Structures are given as structure tokens and as C-alpha cells.
Amino acid sequence: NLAPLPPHVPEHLVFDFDMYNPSNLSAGVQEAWAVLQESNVPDLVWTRCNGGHWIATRGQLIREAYEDYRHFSSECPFIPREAGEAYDFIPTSMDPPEQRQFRALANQVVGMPVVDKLENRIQELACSLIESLRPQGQCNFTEDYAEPFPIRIFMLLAGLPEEDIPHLGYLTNQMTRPDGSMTFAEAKEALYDYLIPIIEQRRQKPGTDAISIVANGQVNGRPITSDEAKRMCGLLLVGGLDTVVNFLSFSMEFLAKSPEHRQELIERPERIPAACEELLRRFSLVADGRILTSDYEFHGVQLKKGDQILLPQMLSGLDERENAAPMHVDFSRQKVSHTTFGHGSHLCAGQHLARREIIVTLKEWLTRIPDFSIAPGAQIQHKSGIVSGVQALPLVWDPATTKAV
Ligand code: HEM
Ligand SMILES: CC1(C)[C@@H]2CC[C@@]1(C)C(=O)C2
Ligand SMILES: [K+]
Ligand SMILES: [K+]
Numbered sequence: 001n002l003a004p005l006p007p008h009v010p011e012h013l014v015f016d017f018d019m020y021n022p023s024n025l026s027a028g029v030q031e032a033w034a035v036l037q038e039s040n041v042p043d044l045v046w047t048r049c050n051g052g053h054w055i056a057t058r059g060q061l062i063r064e065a066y067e068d069y070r071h072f073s074s075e076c077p078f079i080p081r082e083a084g085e086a087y088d089f090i091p092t093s094m095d096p097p098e099q100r101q102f103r104a105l106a107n108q109v110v111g112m113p114v115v116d117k118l119e120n121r122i123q124e125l126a127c128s129l130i131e132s133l134r135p136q137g138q139c140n141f142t143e144d145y146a147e148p149f150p151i152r153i154f155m156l157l158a159g160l161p162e163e164d165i166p167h168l169g170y171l172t173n174q175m176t177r178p179d180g181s182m183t184f185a186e187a188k189e190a191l192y193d194y195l196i197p198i199i200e201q202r203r204q205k206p207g208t209d210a211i212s213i214v215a216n217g218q219v220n221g222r223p224i225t226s227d228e229a230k231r232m233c234g235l236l237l238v239g240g241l242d243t244v245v246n247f248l249s250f251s252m253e254f255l256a257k258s259p260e261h262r263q264e265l266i267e268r269p270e271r272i273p274a275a276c277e278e279l280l281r282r283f284s285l286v287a288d289g290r291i292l293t294s295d296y297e298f299h300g301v302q303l304k305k306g307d308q309i310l311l312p313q314m315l316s317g318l319d320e321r322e323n324a325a326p327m328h329v330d331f332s333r334q335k336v337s338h339t340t341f342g343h344g345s346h347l348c349a350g351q352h353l354a355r356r357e358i359i360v361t362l363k364e365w366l367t368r369i370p371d372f373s374i375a376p377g378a379q380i381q382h383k384s385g386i387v388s389g390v391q392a393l394p395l396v397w398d399p400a401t402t403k404a405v
Contacts, residue, residue: 002048059316072290083184154240159209249390250283
């Protein structure tokens with residue numbers, strides 16, 4: 001299902017990669033995307049899939065483009081174009097300098113200070129979920145930990161009821177890995193109709209939750225509007241429910257297959273942060289992009305005003321030009337080069353929360369359940385989109401080899 005090749009695109013640059021269903025998905029999603037970095041593929045290519053768009057395949061190009069917001073605007077950051085145009089989240093649908101005052105407020109609510117605020121709840125919940133699973137000797141990790149652990153901490157941070165998780169998660173999934181059951185526009189308006197009354201309630205009677213803080217915050221000297229508060233809160237939801245949730249499954253799938261990597265962390269837990277970095281590199285999972293604000297020649301390639309370009313955050317750290325043996329997980333890498341949390345002005349505002357959830361998960365899981373594996377004969381299926389994911393991760397273990405703390 002290819003869109004007609006636009007007249008300005010040389011055919012030697014054509015490579016029909018489908019970011020929502022890559023040909024090589026069975027081998028793993030990161031492997032499926034890494035075909036873009038084989039010798040037969042140029043640095044910057046055009047796919048006719050999903051409406052037609054560019055893809056930069058090298059970390060150097062991806063970083064350069066994310067840095068140069070003048071040519072590569074965030075106004076339409078999603079593929080396909082209908083999704084990008086509908087996408088109005090704050091601050092991600094804005095360029096500098098407009099982005100600035102909204103970013104400060106985002107950081108107030110999901111940045112470092114809030115991690116330090118919630119540290120104990122994060123630790124408490126991980127221990128609680130894991131201890132509860134430990135004597136079963138089995139679990140479906142996606143639904144049993146990967147989802148409830150980060151999502152409940154986010155609902156806690158946002159003061160929203162856990163009753164709304166299955167609903168919210170669904171709409172959020174629709175914006176990252178669409179079912180086809182609803183357009184991006186449908187999903188957004190569903191999420192907005194959920195948020196709107198809550199925000200109004202909380203502008204009238206301010207709480208201490210993230211939503212109250214955003215909705216009563218200040219930008220450009222004035223009160224934030226109800227619409228703006230909604231557009232920021234919408235993004236916070238997506239980040240809360242469809243990032244770390246997916247990442248945790250990739251990591252745990254890997255660890256289920258590598259006993260030596262597990263023991264490495266169990267014996268020297270001070271290496272856990274560096275290991276988190278490496279896993280974030282190897283199992284990077286995000287791919288959005290930008291839109292050309294004008295005709296622009298970029299590394300020898302003529303880009304036209306209005307062209308969309310996908311700038312896969314996932315690819316930079318997999319680029320062999322940035323990391324030798326990129327598909328190998330190596331906790332001792334002197335430098336873990338990646339752009340897993342993005343690059344430029346829109347660098348992830350929630351990355352400290354994310355790292356915290358990852359590091360707590362690694363430590364607390366391996367403490368109690370050091371020895372586990374994927375269920376016998378189970379086939380693990382990855383899914384691809386703006387944020388990549390795992391359909392299910394059946395794990396098994398002998399409870400005799402586990403340990404309560
Ligand atoms: C493994 C976990 C995560 C990954 C890989 C990730 C990745 C990213 C990336 C690549 C961007 C930049 C998008 C762009 O440049 O267009 C971004 C932005 C953002 N993310 Fe994260 N994210 C994660 C977790 C979270 C969490 C838990 C939150 C909490 C709500 C969050 C909140 C945000 C916000 C608010 C922005 C916008 C910052 C701005 O536009 O100035 N993220 N994220
Ligand atoms: C691309 C992202 C990972 C980043 C945070 C959530 C996400 C889906 C966005 O809309 C911005
Ligand atoms: K390439
Ligand atoms: K838009």
C-alpha cells in the first residue's frame with residue numbers, strides 16, 4: 001500500500017519501510033528497524049509507506065535534525081500526516097522559543113523533584129507487586145508488572161483513580177500502536193473528554209497532584225488556559241502509560257534469557273544505573289519526527305517544505321557508528337551512546353522518573369526472583385509504532401529459588 005513517489009524524490013533513495021509493521025518483526029522490533037542500517041540502505045531514505053515520508057537512519061543525522069528546529073518543526077511530529085496534524089500536545093507540538101515556558105511546568109510535575117517526592121512509593125509498589133508474584137512461579141509480565149507498576153505510580157502522581165487505567169491505557173495505545181479501530185483524532189478526543197471535567201474540577205479546587213499543578217500553573221505571565229492544561233495533561237498521560245510500560249517488557253525479556261547479566265547486577269548493584277543505560281540503548285523503542293518548514297538540502301538530499309521526516313530515536317544507539325557491536329548488551333561499555341529519551345529542546349522531561357522506575361525494577365526483581373526464564377515454547381511478539389511494545393511476556397520460575405526480603 002504505497003503512496004505515489006513525489007517528483008522530487010530520486011528512486012535510489014526509496015526504501016519502503018513500514019514503521020507500524022516492519023518486515024522483520026519476528027526477529028525482534030529493534031532488529032526489524034536495524035535493517036535500515038544495512039549497507040544497501042542510504043543514510044537518508046524515503047519510504048512510500050504510510051503516506052510517504054523520509055527516515056534518517058544514522059545517529060548523526062537524527063541528532064542534527066532534532067537540534068535544528070528551524071527546518072525540522074515539531075508542529076506535525078507524528079506519522080502518518082493525519083496523526084501529526086491532529087497531534088496538539090504541549091510542549092511537544094511546539095518549537096522553541098514557544099516551547100520554553102510550558103517545559104518548565106512539565107518539569108515541575110514529572111521531573112526530578114517529583115521523583116524525589118515519590119521515591120518511597122515507587123520502591124514500595126515495586127516490592128509489593130513483586131513479592132505478590134514471587135510464590136506463583138509464573139506471571140504474564142506485561143499485565144502483571146509492566147503495566148500496573150508505572151501506571152499506578154502515574155495515576156498516584158496525577159491523583160487519578162486506578163479504576164480508569166484499562167480505559168486510559170487503551171486510548172493511549174491507540175496513539176502509539178493504532179488498532180485501526182480508531183483514528184489518532186478519535187483517540188485524542190476520547191482522552192480529552194476524560195480530562196476536561198477533571199481539569200475544571202481542579203482549577204476550582206486546587207490539589208497537590210500533577211493535574212492540579214499544571215491546570216493552575218503560569219505561562220507567559222498569565223494563567224494557563226483550560227485548553228492548554230488539557231493538551232499538556234494529555235501528553236503526561238501518554239508518557240505515563242505508554243513508555244516505561246513497554247520498555248520494561250523488552251528488558252525483562254532480555255534478562256529472562258541471560259543468567260550472567262542477571263548475576264552481574266545482583267553481585268554489584270552499583271552497576272545497575274549503567275546497566276539501565278545500556279538496556280535503554282539496546283531496547284530503545286521510540287520513533288517520532290518532524291516536518292520541514294521550508295525546502296532544504298540536508299546532507300545532499302533535497303527535502304521539500306511540508307515533507308515529513310521520521311527521526312527514529314531508537315536508531316541512534318543501534319548505529320554501529322556510535323556503538324560497536326550494537327546488538328550486544330554490554331554493561332561495561334565505556335560510553336553508552338543513545339538518544340532513547342530524544343534530543344534537542346524536546347529531550348524527555350520525564351526521564352528521571354523513567355530511570356528510577358527501571359533501576360528499582362531491576363534491583364527489586366533480581367533480589368527476589370534472580371532465576372527465571374521465558375515460558376517453554378512461548379513465542380514473544382513485538383509490535384511497532386511511535387512507541388514499540390511487547391504483546392505478552394510469559395515468564396516462569398521455580399519458587400524454591402526465589403526469596404522474600
Ligand atoms: C522509557 C521511557 C521513556 C522514553 C523512552 C521517552 C521518550 C521520549 C522522547 C523520545 C521524547 C521527545 C519526543 C520529541 O522530541 O518529539 C519525550 C518527550 C517527553 N516525555 Fe518522555 N519518555 C519516557 C518516559 C516518560 C515518562 C514516564 C513521562 C512522564 C509523564 C514522560 C514525559 C515526557 C514529556 C512531558 C515530554 C515532552 C518534553 C518537551 O516536549 O519539552 N516521558 N519522551
Ligand atoms: C513520542 C513520545 C514518546 C514522547 C512522550 C510520549 C510520546 C508518545 C509523545 O507524544 C512525546
Ligand atoms: K542507512
Ligand atoms: K499538529
